[PDB]
């Protein structure tokens, strides 16, 4: 019910709870997230988009940032019209149902007033702090580059020119946000979403890793990717199919099971599901076939809307 | 003599010797230097301006850069209207005889096309490279700031957007210029002028430490400032008064001396003067007063034009 807990849902960290409550009292508020344009949109993008719609529905005006520059800066893509990728990216977010104010990076990040504050910011940032903020975002080049330390201050100075009271992002962005809370004049609050494990089970879910499900993928592809996933019995930590169960699932839900071995088991909470998978009452194969079907149902509207 | 040797004169290093010749053969040609604007213009600035005039005499169109932006980036000053300070510096350089295209930094270091190339350059520059190039130009901060690593690329990028075939500066700016030779497509020629030691002798000449002789200093000060200089008999290295004779005074010179100790002696070259000090044949009080009197003469026209 309460808009606080609706926002706090599935959020690993909120800095801070109290500070959020004070700016909830304000009449007009803004929340902002930024995405580097990626070819295929995966589930980790959806989870963040969910929380923006939660803030949007809570009265927030939403700013979504497309970091077309950081593609060159972080060597993500040496393509000119990456905006074309971001166009589709912008379209996919609208298909999910988030009407926001999409601000491309190249529009606002070469202005003289902004570039000045970037140097002003570099006057207060130390080399050690900047590298520390990029331990989970950068590429960790053997011969590191000057662009690595420019990425955080541009990230921090962007938050300023967007003036968003709420700054959202993955847990990867925790350190740049703490740096931004230190240097920026206004103390924006930070909402950090959990990092999804991949279907490989070894690393985080990223498109380049290939361990990703796409809202654009075909129903049979979702069946196959899940069928091969790292779903171990008695494992809830590091289990990606259990992560899908925690976030993108709707309760109650019916799991088909013949009565000889148990019976149709309707679950009403992930904590119920977590207790049954941990004590080995539910088999991974059964969990995979169940989680797959709802995901196909949930991503199907977003699919046809494209 | 020839425009080469006039340009080589009193230069520590020229990268490259063969390249400068090819630049001189080109009819149209440009050379550029840059200065962080300071309140008082000491002798160390005059030496750099001289070599621009030597480049200007050879036909090089000259560009002087005023690093108004780097007044904050290196924390040289937090004052806003540094322009008025640098505007006084403009006329000061003209009195020395240098008419040039003065380009303020802030008027171009914030453009869209310039800023973008800074990032594109940061995608080819490593952190260790920029940190080493800043060794002689740093503030020796305990916790280094990101602005220290940003500074050299802006220089390397400023050199590009000025397209100056000849990039000239102090010997401390060597590594920044060696970075521009590696990164920039046009291999600009580098001319490195020596570093003048300060009157204290322990440090170098800077407007901060106060061990400087300004071109607007009053004639009695030049005598008193030189009177308390580190002039060690028999040492030419690290001798500031010796360096004044090497780069600024004109020859031949006759030092006044009673006959009993050798009489008035005629020195026709700094090498002869350098030989006498090593051979103890010349006392510092003599060399001090002699160097001072010749200096006020040289600084007299520049000093008068500033007045009124
Ligand atoms: N680091 C991300 C990419 C990224 C790049 C720039 C960026 O700053 C812009 C911004 C910042 C805070 C609030 C709102 C906005 N905004 O412009 O809407 C945000 C994200 C990644 O690793 O994907
Ligand atoms: N480093 C100096 C100050 C300094 C600042 C900027 C600078 O680059 C600009 C430039 C460079 C070469 C040719 C032309 C131009 N230009 O843009 O006119 C050069 C020197 C000091 O520490 O005193």
Numbering used by the authors:
A (entry chain A): 1 to 306
B (entry chain B): 1 to 308
What does the paper say about this structure?
Genetically encoded caged amino acids can be used to control the dynamics of protein activities and cellular localization in response to external cues. In the present study, we revealed the structural basis for the recognition of O-(2-nitrobenzyl)-L-tyrosine (oNBTyr) by its specific variant of Methanocaldococcus jannaschii tyrosyl-tRNA synthetase (oNBTyrRS), and then demonstrated its potential availability for time-resolved X-ray crystallography. In contrast, the genetic encoding of caged amino acids offers a more facile and robust approach for biosynthesizing the photoresponsive proteins. These synthetic amino acids are recognized by specific variants of aminoacyl-tRNA synthetase and attach to tRNA, which in turn translates codons (mostly the UAG stop codon) assigned to the amino acids. Thus, cell-free protein synthesis of caged proteins with oNBTyr could facilitate time-resolved structural analysis of proteins, including medically important membrane proteins.
In the present study, we determined the crystal structure of another archaeal tyrosyl-tRNA synthetase variant (oNBTyrRS) complexed with O-(2-nitrobenzyl)-L-tyrosine. The substrate-bound crystal structure of oNBTyrRS at a 2.79 Å resolution indicated that the replacement of tyrosine and leucine at positions 32 and 65 by glycine (Tyr32Gly and Leu65Gly, respectively) and Asp158Ser created sufficient space for entry of the bulky substitute into the amino acid binding pocket, while Glu in place of Leu162 formed a hydrogen bond with the nitro moiety of oNBTyr. The five mutated residues play essential roles in the recognition of the structural features of oNBTyr. The substitutions of Tyr32 and Leu65 for Gly and Asp158 for Ser created enough space to accommodate the bulky nitrobenzyl group. In addition, glutamates replaced with Phe108 and Leu162 form a so-called carboxyl (Glu108)-carboxylate (Glu162) dimer motif. Furthermore, these residues, together with the oxygen of the nitro group, formed a hydrogen-bonding network, which was stabilized by the participation of Ser158. The nitro group was slightly bent with respect to the planarity of the benzyl group, thus the crucial recognition of the nitro group, which is important for substrate discrimination, was exhibited. Although the chemical structure of oNPTyr was larger than that of oNBTyr, the fitting model showed no structural distortion. This is because the substrate binding pocket of oNBTyrRS was open toward the surface of the enzyme. The nitro group of the leaving group forms a polar interaction only with the main chain of Ala70 in the hydrophobic environment. These comparisons indicate that two different mechanisms are achieved among the synthetase variants for the recognition of the same leaving group. It provides a structural basis for the recognition of caged tyrosine, oNBTyr by mutant TyrRS.
